[PDB]
Protein backbone atom coordinates (compact mmCIF):
# COMPACT_ATOMS: atom_id res chain seq x y z
CA UNK A 1 0.00 0.00 0.00
CA UNK A 2 1.03 3.61 -0.62
CA UNK A 3 0.65 6.72 1.55
CA UNK A 4 0.93 9.60 -0.91
CA UNK A 5 -1.60 9.90 -3.73
CA UNK A 6 -2.59 12.63 -6.24
CA UNK A 7 -4.96 15.31 -4.93
CA UNK A 8 -8.51 13.93 -5.10
CA UNK A 9 -7.34 11.43 -7.71
CA UNK A 10 -6.22 14.11 -10.16
CA UNK A 11 -2.44 13.81 -10.74
CA UNK A 12 -2.24 17.02 -12.76
CA UNK A 13 -3.62 19.42 -10.18
CA UNK A 14 -0.68 21.10 -8.47
CA UNK A 15 -0.88 19.34 -5.11
CA UNK A 16 -0.55 16.03 -3.26
CA UNK A 17 -2.60 14.10 -0.72
CA UNK A 18 -0.61 13.24 2.41
CA UNK A 19 -1.48 12.33 6.03
CA UNK A 20 -0.80 15.99 6.83
CA UNK A 21 -3.14 17.28 4.11
CA UNK A 22 -5.88 14.66 4.18
CA UNK A 23 -6.32 12.35 7.17
CA UNK A 24 -9.50 11.88 9.28
CA UNK A 25 -8.10 13.73 12.33
CA UNK A 26 -6.84 16.84 10.53
CA UNK A 27 -9.82 16.86 8.15
CA UNK A 28 -12.29 16.75 11.03
CA UNK A 29 -10.23 19.36 12.90
CA UNK A 30 -10.10 21.90 10.06
CA UNK A 31 -13.70 21.31 8.99
CA UNK A 32 -14.77 22.20 12.53
CA UNK A 33 -12.85 25.48 12.54
CA UNK A 34 -14.96 28.69 12.33
CA UNK A 35 -13.31 29.52 9.01
CA UNK A 36 -14.64 26.37 7.35
CA UNK A 37 -18.20 26.49 8.74
CA UNK A 38 -19.27 27.10 5.14
CA UNK A 39 -23.02 26.93 5.86
CA UNK A 40 -23.25 29.23 8.89
CA UNK A 41 -23.42 33.02 9.29
CA UNK A 42 -19.97 34.66 8.88
CA UNK A 43 -20.82 36.91 11.84
CA UNK A 44 -20.60 34.10 14.40
CA UNK A 45 -17.44 32.76 12.78
CA UNK A 46 -15.97 36.23 13.14
CA UNK A 47 -16.94 36.29 16.81
CA UNK A 48 -15.14 33.00 17.48
CA UNK A 49 -12.01 33.83 15.47
CA UNK A 50 -11.67 37.31 16.96
CA UNK A 51 -12.35 35.98 20.45
CA UNK A 52 -9.59 33.38 20.26
CA UNK A 53 -7.11 35.72 18.59
CA UNK A 54 -7.59 38.66 20.96
CA UNK A 55 -7.41 36.22 23.86
CA UNK A 56 -4.05 34.83 22.73
CA UNK A 57 -2.90 38.34 21.79
CA UNK A 58 -3.16 39.51 25.39
CA UNK A 59 -0.39 37.09 26.42
CA UNK A 60 2.80 38.20 24.60
CA UNK A 61 2.02 41.93 24.96
CA UNK A 62 1.74 41.76 28.74
CA UNK A 63 4.86 39.67 29.41
CA UNK A 64 7.17 40.99 26.67
CA UNK A 65 6.03 44.61 26.44
CA UNK A 66 7.96 47.65 27.76
CA UNK A 67 5.96 47.76 31.00
CA UNK A 68 6.23 44.05 31.81
CA UNK A 69 8.10 44.81 35.04
CA UNK A 70 5.72 47.50 36.27
CA UNK A 71 2.50 47.56 38.30
CA UNK A 72 0.81 48.68 35.09
CA UNK A 73 1.74 45.62 33.02
CA UNK A 74 -1.71 44.15 32.43
CA UNK A 75 -3.37 47.45 31.50
CA UNK A 76 -0.64 48.35 29.02
CA UNK A 77 -0.38 44.91 27.43
CA UNK A 78 -4.14 44.46 27.11
CA UNK A 79 -4.51 47.95 25.66
CA UNK A 80 -1.83 47.14 23.09
CA UNK A 81 -3.62 43.90 22.25
CA UNK A 82 -6.82 45.86 21.73
CA UNK A 83 -4.88 48.23 19.50
CA UNK A 84 -3.63 45.38 17.32
CA UNK A 85 -7.22 44.10 17.26
CA UNK A 86 -8.37 47.46 15.91
CA UNK A 87 -5.55 47.60 13.34
CA UNK A 88 -6.22 44.05 12.16
CA UNK A 89 -9.93 44.90 11.96
CA UNK A 90 -8.93 47.83 9.77
CA UNK A 91 -6.84 45.47 7.62
CA UNK A 92 -9.72 43.01 7.33
CA UNK A 93 -12.04 45.89 6.45
CA UNK A 94 -9.90 47.30 3.63
CA UNK A 95 -9.32 43.74 2.42
CA UNK A 96 -13.08 43.31 2.19
CA UNK A 97 -13.59 46.65 0.45
CA UNK A 98 -10.84 45.97 -2.07
CA UNK A 99 -11.56 42.30 -2.82
CA UNK A 100 -15.35 42.16 -3.08
CA UNK A 101 -17.80 44.39 -4.93
CA UNK A 102 -21.27 44.62 -3.39
CA UNK A 103 -22.75 43.17 -6.58
CA UNK A 104 -20.23 40.38 -7.17
CA UNK A 105 -21.25 36.85 -6.06
CA UNK A 106 -19.20 34.43 -3.94
CA UNK A 107 -15.69 33.50 -5.09
CA UNK A 108 -15.65 30.48 -2.77
CA UNK A 109 -15.74 26.92 -4.18
CA UNK A 110 -19.15 25.55 -5.18
CA UNK A 111 -18.11 21.89 -5.22
CA UNK A 112 -17.08 19.22 -2.71
CA UNK A 113 -14.31 16.62 -2.85
CA UNK A 114 -16.88 14.11 -4.12
CA UNK A 115 -17.80 16.56 -6.87
CA UNK A 116 -21.35 17.41 -5.84
CA UNK A 117 -22.63 20.98 -5.95
CA UNK A 118 -23.13 22.96 -2.75
CA UNK A 119 -23.85 26.50 -1.56
CA UNK A 120 -20.71 28.67 -1.89
CA UNK A 121 -19.32 30.15 1.32
CA UNK A 122 -20.87 33.57 1.93
CA UNK A 123 -17.64 34.48 3.71
CA UNK A 124 -16.27 35.34 0.26
CA UNK A 125 -18.78 38.13 -0.35
CA UNK A 126 -18.80 41.85 0.49
CA UNK A 127 -21.62 41.64 3.05
CA UNK A 128 -20.31 38.34 4.40
CA UNK A 129 -16.78 39.65 4.83
CA UNK A 130 -18.11 42.83 6.44
CA UNK A 131 -20.02 40.70 8.94
CA UNK A 132 -16.91 38.60 9.53
CA UNK A 133 -14.88 41.74 10.23
CA UNK A 134 -17.53 43.08 12.59
CA UNK A 135 -17.34 39.76 14.40
CA UNK A 136 -13.55 39.94 14.53
CA UNK A 137 -13.70 43.41 16.08
CA UNK A 138 -16.44 42.64 18.61
CA UNK A 139 -15.02 39.23 19.50
CA UNK A 140 -11.49 40.62 19.45
CA UNK A 141 -12.10 43.38 21.97
CA UNK A 142 -14.32 41.04 24.01
CA UNK A 143 -11.55 38.44 24.09
CA UNK A 144 -8.95 40.97 25.17
CA UNK A 145 -11.23 42.18 27.96
CA UNK A 146 -12.00 38.61 29.05
CA UNK A 147 -8.36 37.53 29.13
CA UNK A 148 -7.42 40.68 31.05
CA UNK A 149 -10.18 39.90 33.53
CA UNK A 150 -8.95 36.34 34.04
CA UNK A 151 -5.37 37.54 34.41
CA UNK A 152 -5.72 40.58 36.68
CA UNK A 153 -9.23 40.65 38.18
CA UNK B 1 -11.20 7.28 -15.49
CA UNK B 2 -10.67 10.69 -17.08
CA UNK B 3 -10.35 14.19 -15.62
CA UNK B 4 -11.51 16.46 -18.45
CA UNK B 5 -15.11 17.63 -18.88
CA UNK B 6 -16.32 20.74 -20.69
CA UNK B 7 -19.72 20.59 -18.97
CA UNK B 8 -17.97 20.35 -15.59
CA UNK B 9 -15.00 22.71 -15.66
CA UNK B 10 -15.14 22.81 -11.86
CA UNK B 11 -13.95 19.25 -11.29
CA UNK B 12 -11.60 19.54 -14.27
CA UNK B 13 -9.53 22.28 -12.64
CA UNK B 14 -9.83 21.07 -9.05
CA UNK B 15 -12.05 23.90 -7.83
CA UNK B 16 -12.99 21.96 -4.69
CA UNK B 17 -13.75 22.95 -1.11
CA UNK B 18 -11.25 20.75 0.71
CA UNK B 19 -12.40 21.38 4.28
CA UNK B 20 -15.68 23.32 4.04
CA UNK B 21 -18.52 21.60 5.91
CA UNK B 22 -22.23 21.98 5.10
CA UNK B 23 -23.09 21.49 8.79
CA UNK B 24 -25.65 23.88 10.36
CA UNK B 25 -24.73 26.42 13.06
CA UNK B 26 -23.21 24.58 16.05
CA UNK B 27 -23.21 27.81 18.07
CA UNK B 28 -25.21 28.88 21.10
CA UNK B 29 -28.66 30.16 19.99
CA UNK B 30 -28.92 32.72 22.80
CA UNK B 31 -25.34 33.85 22.24
CA UNK B 32 -26.13 33.82 18.51
CA UNK B 33 -28.96 36.30 19.07
CA UNK B 34 -26.74 38.30 21.42
CA UNK B 35 -24.00 38.69 18.82
CA UNK B 36 -26.42 39.16 15.90
CA UNK B 37 -27.99 42.11 17.74
CA UNK B 38 -24.99 43.64 19.53
CA UNK B 39 -22.25 43.20 16.90
CA UNK B 40 -24.49 44.42 14.07
CA UNK B 41 -23.31 48.09 14.02
CA UNK B 42 -19.83 46.92 12.99
CA UNK B 43 -21.08 44.87 10.04
CA UNK B 44 -21.19 47.87 7.70
CA UNK B 45 -17.69 48.09 6.26
CA UNK B 46 -17.70 51.80 5.42
CA UNK B 47 -19.10 52.78 8.80
CA UNK B 48 -16.73 50.33 10.46
CA UNK B 49 -13.78 51.85 8.61
CA UNK B 50 -14.75 55.38 9.65
CA UNK B 51 -15.33 54.24 13.24
CA UNK B 52 -12.04 52.35 13.49
CA UNK B 53 -9.98 55.17 11.96
CA UNK B 54 -11.58 58.12 13.77
CA UNK B 55 -12.13 56.21 17.01
CA UNK B 56 -8.66 54.69 16.92
CA UNK B 57 -7.05 58.05 16.27
CA UNK B 58 -9.13 59.60 19.03
CA UNK B 59 -8.13 56.89 21.51
CA UNK B 60 -4.47 57.11 20.56
CA UNK B 61 -4.60 60.89 20.98
CA UNK B 62 -6.26 60.46 24.37
CA UNK B 63 -3.80 57.98 25.87
CA UNK B 64 -0.92 59.93 24.31
CA UNK B 65 -1.89 63.41 25.50
CA UNK B 66 -2.50 62.11 29.03
CA UNK B 67 0.45 59.73 29.40
CA UNK B 68 1.91 59.76 32.92
CA UNK B 69 5.56 60.49 33.62
CA UNK B 70 5.88 57.13 35.36
CA UNK B 71 5.13 55.41 32.06
CA UNK B 72 6.98 57.51 29.47
CA UNK B 73 10.48 58.87 30.21
CA UNK B 74 9.88 61.39 27.41
CA UNK B 75 7.09 63.07 29.38
CA UNK B 76 9.01 62.95 32.66
CA UNK B 77 11.80 64.94 31.03
CA UNK B 78 15.39 65.40 32.25
CA UNK B 79 15.99 65.15 36.01
CA UNK B 80 19.77 65.58 36.13
CA UNK B 81 21.67 68.86 35.61
CA UNK B 82 22.79 69.53 32.02
CA UNK B 83 26.36 68.79 30.93
CA UNK B 84 28.48 71.33 29.07
CA UNK B 85 29.36 70.83 25.41
CA UNK B 86 32.81 69.94 23.98
CA UNK B 87 34.07 73.48 23.38
CA UNK B 88 32.55 75.15 26.44
CA UNK B 89 29.24 75.43 24.60
CA UNK B 90 25.86 75.30 26.36
CA UNK C 1 21.72 42.42 -2.63
CA UNK C 2 19.63 44.05 -5.31
CA UNK C 3 22.72 44.82 -7.39
CA UNK C 4 24.38 41.38 -7.35
CA UNK C 5 21.50 38.87 -7.54
CA UNK C 6 19.26 39.20 -10.58
CA UNK C 7 15.65 38.44 -11.49
CA UNK C 8 15.05 34.81 -12.55
CA UNK C 9 16.14 33.32 -9.23
CA UNK C 10 13.65 35.47 -7.36
CA UNK C 11 10.89 34.90 -9.92
CA UNK C 12 11.11 31.12 -9.53
CA UNK C 13 11.36 31.42 -5.75
CA UNK C 14 8.21 33.54 -5.76
CA UNK C 15 6.53 30.89 -7.92
CA UNK C 16 7.19 28.28 -5.22
CA UNK C 17 5.81 30.76 -2.67
CA UNK C 18 2.64 31.23 -4.74
CA UNK C 19 2.14 27.49 -4.81
CA UNK C 20 2.78 27.49 -1.06
CA UNK C 21 0.05 30.05 -0.47
CA UNK C 22 -2.55 28.35 -2.68
CA UNK C 23 -1.96 25.06 -0.81
CA UNK C 24 -1.99 26.33 2.79
CA UNK C 25 -5.39 25.92 4.57
CA UNK C 26 -6.97 28.87 6.43
CA UNK C 27 -4.50 31.11 4.60
CA UNK C 28 -6.19 29.75 1.48
CA UNK C 29 -9.16 31.92 2.37
CA UNK C 30 -7.04 35.00 1.68
CA UNK C 31 -5.99 35.69 -1.91
CA UNK C 32 -4.05 38.44 -3.67
CA UNK C 33 -5.58 40.80 -6.24
CA UNK C 34 -2.26 41.57 -7.88
CA UNK C 35 -0.14 38.56 -8.85
CA UNK C 36 3.19 38.52 -6.97
CA UNK C 37 6.18 38.75 -9.30
CA UNK C 38 9.88 39.53 -8.97
CA UNK C 39 10.99 43.13 -9.52
CA UNK C 40 11.98 43.95 -13.10
CA UNK C 41 15.61 44.09 -14.26
CA UNK C 42 15.73 47.87 -14.55
CA UNK C 43 13.64 48.22 -11.39
CA UNK C 44 16.21 46.06 -9.64
CA UNK C 45 19.04 48.28 -10.83
CA UNK C 46 17.19 51.38 -9.61
CA UNK C 47 16.23 50.00 -6.19
CA UNK C 48 19.74 48.63 -5.69
CA UNK C 49 21.32 51.95 -6.63
CA UNK C 50 18.91 53.71 -4.27
CA UNK C 51 19.79 51.54 -1.28
CA UNK C 52 23.47 51.98 -2.21
CA UNK C 53 23.25 55.78 -2.40
CA UNK C 54 21.16 56.18 0.74
CA UNK C 55 23.54 53.95 2.67
CA UNK C 56 26.49 55.89 1.28
CA UNK C 57 25.10 59.32 2.23
CA UNK C 58 23.73 58.37 5.65
CA UNK C 59 26.90 56.53 6.68
CA UNK C 60 29.20 59.38 5.69
CA UNK C 61 26.86 61.96 7.24
CA UNK C 62 26.83 60.13 10.55
CA UNK C 63 30.63 59.82 10.50
CA UNK C 64 31.11 63.46 9.48
CA UNK C 65 28.82 64.96 12.11
CA UNK C 66 29.85 62.58 14.90
CA UNK C 67 33.61 62.83 14.36
CA UNK C 68 33.50 66.61 13.99
CA UNK C 69 30.98 67.55 16.71
CA UNK C 70 32.40 64.97 19.10
CA UNK C 71 35.39 67.25 19.57
CA UNK C 72 34.41 70.38 17.63
CA UNK C 73 37.86 70.68 16.06
Amino acid sequence: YQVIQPINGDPFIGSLETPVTSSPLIAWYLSNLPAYRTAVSPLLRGIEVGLAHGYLLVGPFVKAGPLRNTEIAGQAGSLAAGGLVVILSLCLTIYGISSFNEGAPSTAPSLTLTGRKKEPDQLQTADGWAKFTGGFFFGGISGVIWAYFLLYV
Amino acid sequence: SVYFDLEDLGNTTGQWDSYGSDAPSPYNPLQSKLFETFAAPFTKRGLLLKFLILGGGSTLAYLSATASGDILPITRGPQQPPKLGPRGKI
Amino acid sequence: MFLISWRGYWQELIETLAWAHERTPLANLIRWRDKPVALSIVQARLVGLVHFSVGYIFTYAAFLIASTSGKFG
Partner: peptide, 29 residues
Protein backbone atom coordinates in the same frame (compact mmCIF):
# COMPACT_ATOMS: atom_id res chain seq x y z
CA UNK D 1 6.03 68.98 25.03
CA UNK D 2 2.23 69.33 25.20
CA UNK D 3 1.57 69.59 21.46
CA UNK D 4 4.26 67.06 20.40
CA UNK D 5 2.48 64.37 22.44
CA UNK D 6 -0.52 65.11 20.21
CA UNK D 7 1.05 65.81 16.81
CA UNK D 8 3.81 63.16 16.82
CA UNK D 9 1.55 60.11 17.16
CA UNK D 10 -0.84 61.89 14.80
CA UNK D 11 1.71 62.18 12.00
CA UNK D 12 3.64 59.03 12.88
CA UNK D 13 0.75 56.58 13.31
CA UNK D 14 -2.65 57.98 12.30
CA UNK D 15 -1.59 59.85 9.15
CA UNK D 16 0.39 56.99 7.61
CA UNK D 17 -2.45 54.57 8.44
CA UNK D 18 -5.05 56.79 6.76
CA UNK D 19 -2.76 57.43 3.80
CA UNK D 20 -1.77 53.79 3.33
CA UNK D 21 -5.37 52.60 3.56
CA UNK D 22 -6.52 55.28 1.12
CA UNK D 23 -3.72 54.56 -1.35
CA UNK D 24 -4.37 50.83 -1.02
CA UNK D 25 -8.05 51.22 -1.90
CA UNK D 26 -7.18 53.66 -4.70
CA UNK D 27 -4.58 51.36 -6.29
CA UNK D 28 -6.78 48.27 -5.91
CA UNK D 29 -9.81 49.86 -7.59
Amino acid sequence: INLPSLFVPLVGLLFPAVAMASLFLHVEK
